[PDB]
Amino acid sequence: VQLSPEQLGMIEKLVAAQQQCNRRSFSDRLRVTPWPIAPDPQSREARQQRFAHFTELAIVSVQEIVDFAKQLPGFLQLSREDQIALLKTSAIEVMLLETSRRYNPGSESITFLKDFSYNREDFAKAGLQVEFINPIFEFSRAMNELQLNDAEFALLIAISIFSADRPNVQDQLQVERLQHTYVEALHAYVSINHPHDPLMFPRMLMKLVSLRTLSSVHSEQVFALRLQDKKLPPLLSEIWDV
């Protein structure tokens, strides 16, 4: 079917929310350990600084994600335990999604919040391991290929967040039908916005599959910490470690 008025409003509201959540978060960077410009390839103050920087942006991210979640119609109507379940497990995917959006071809770098382009080495310099960084940058180049737009990333995020099979979700039917609404919307929007390219839709829903893999690799990277003596700050530790 074509883009119903009911839909077009939803999408517009969504793209409205990202800009908002990404605004009230723009203030928080004045509360983020600055990226250290030190020569020592691997000191211990530098290693900690950089790791603080990344882990903190990860924090602002969780909040920018929780804000958005509240803006998606239907989200705030579920058990508080379900809202937790969907965010707990979805967080990582939205992060990877919001990373690809900020992916820079040519530069082969990811610029987080308004500035500073981080590349594979920087990622390394921050604690992450190559077996996670590469998949990350790969998923990036790819999502980038799709040349998606603001609305298209929104809808996707929303679809990611409304995954009824996340562990510990109780009202699975609600979450399901709730997701259908954005899938259906994304389908219409895609057809129109991207005519002559009927695959855009399938290609999109597939990234949802790539996220599940990136998810388990990342969780392979959280355990890896238990042998590095670097700690995740309370928030991240709560949404992941457990």
Partner 1 sequence: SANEDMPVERILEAELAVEDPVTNICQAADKQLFTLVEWAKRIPHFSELPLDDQVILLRAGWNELLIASFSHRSIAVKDGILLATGLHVHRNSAHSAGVGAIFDRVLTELVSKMRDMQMDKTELGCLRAIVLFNPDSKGLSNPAEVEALREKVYASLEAYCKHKYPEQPGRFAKLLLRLPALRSIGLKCLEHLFFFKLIGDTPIDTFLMEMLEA
Ligand X SMILES: COc1ccc(NC2=C(c3ccccc3)C(=O)N(Cc3ccccc3)C2=O)cc1
The one of ligand X, partner 1, none whose footprint includes residue 99, by CB under 5 to 8 A per kind, is ligand X
Looking at 7, 99, 140, 163, which residue binds partner 1 (CB under 8 A)? 163
Q: Report CA 37 to chain centroid distance, whole Å.
A: 27
- Give whole-number Cα distances, 146 to 45, 76, 117, 204, 216, in Å: 39, 31, 21, 8, 24
- Residue 84 binding partner 1, by CB under 8 A: yes
- Residue 73 binding partner 1, by CB under 8 A: no
| Residue for token pair 């500073």 | 116
- Cβ-based nearer residue to ligand X, 58 or 143: 58
Q: Following DSSP, what letter does each residue of 127-184 receive, concatenated?
A: T--HHHHHHHHHHHHHHHHTT--HHHHHHHHHHHHT-TTSTT-S-HHHHHHHHHHHHH
Beta-carbon contacts of 12 under 8 Å, excluding residues fewer than 6 positions away, are: none
The one of partner 1, ligand X, none whose footprint includes residue 234, by CB under 5 to 8 A per kind, is partner 1
- Residue 44 binding partner 1, by CB under 8 A: no
- Residue 83 binding partner 1, by CB under 8 A: yes
Which residues contact partner 1 (rule: CB under 8 A)?
1, 62-63, 66, 69-70, 80-81, 83-84, 87-88, 138, 163, 165, 172, 179-180, 183-184, 187, 198-199, 202-203, 205-206, 208-213, 215-216, 223, 234-235, 238-239, 242
